[PDB]
Design a protein around this ligand. Structure first.
Ligand SMILES: [Zn+2]
Ligand SMILES: [Zn+2]
Ligand SMILES: [Zn+2]
Ligand SMILES: [Zn+2]
Lengths: 143, 143
């Protein structure tokens, strides 16, 4: 059974993944307003991906005997200064998500919760892949 | 091209469908905390359904030459007084959604926007079906 400290950290991260989904959807509203169909499609796909992350947290919290509490979702920005600016904001946000997950990992290690440590490995690896994808696009578009 | 009045009404409704999705997800967190797997599955399915409603508004707004702006999402309630209480709250919320859609229909009729009138017919019919499904469940569980 997860300690209340770890359950709160996971529930917090659940809410962060929801906001991530919303933020990527907002980036899609920007790209679509400009007619950048392909980049909008990229963002809508990532928004759906972030929802599956949230639900994986959701189901793990209930497997470990905890409960999920949904919080208010902040209004995301709706405008950026071009393609590169939007993707740089995406990368900055993913780096914040990576740091948040690592803080849960450290908490789980402290409490010797080796089930949460194992559950999080998938997300450490997926953040690497996501960060690399965004860097790959920024490098493609450079100068 | 949609007038700014109608675009704002549709964007408002887009945001209402997002909140509807969130509210049904919150009801799932309640049912799951109680071990009501089947009712939780019902709510998660409805939450996904409400997202597809939101995206149908999303794509229609861009077809008509408008843009979507995402707003803050309010924190939904997380607790109800039993199954019946949660479904009665669902029905009350769907009736509010039905009234909101009818107000867009009346606005569209006033501006003679027969494309928005036609777009909304699908949602008038779907609200009937959703309201009937929730009433059917409440009647099944009665007394
Ligand atoms: Zn994620
Ligand atoms: Zn992510
Ligand atoms: Zn709906
Ligand atoms: Zn509905």
């Amino acid at each position: 059974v997860i300690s209340e400290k770890v359950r709160k950290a996971l529930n917090d991260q659940l809410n962060r993944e929801i906001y991530s989904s919303y933020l990527y959807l907002s980036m899609a509203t920007y790209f679509d307003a400009e007619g950048f169909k392909g980049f909008a499609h990229w963002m809508k796909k990532q928004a759906q991906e972030e929802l599956t992350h949230a639900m994986k947290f959701y189901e793990y919290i209930y497997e470990r005997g905890g409960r999920v509490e949904l919080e208010a979702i902040e209004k995301p920005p709706s405008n950026w200064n071009g393609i590169k600016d939007a993707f740089e904001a995406a990368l900055k946000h993913e780096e914040f998500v990576t740091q948040s997950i690592y803080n849960i990992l450290e908490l789980a290690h402290e409490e010797k919760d080796h089930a949460t440590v194992s559950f999080l490995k998938w997300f450490v690896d997926e953040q690497v892949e996501e960060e690399d994808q965004v860097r790959e696009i920024l490098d493609l578009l450079e100068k």
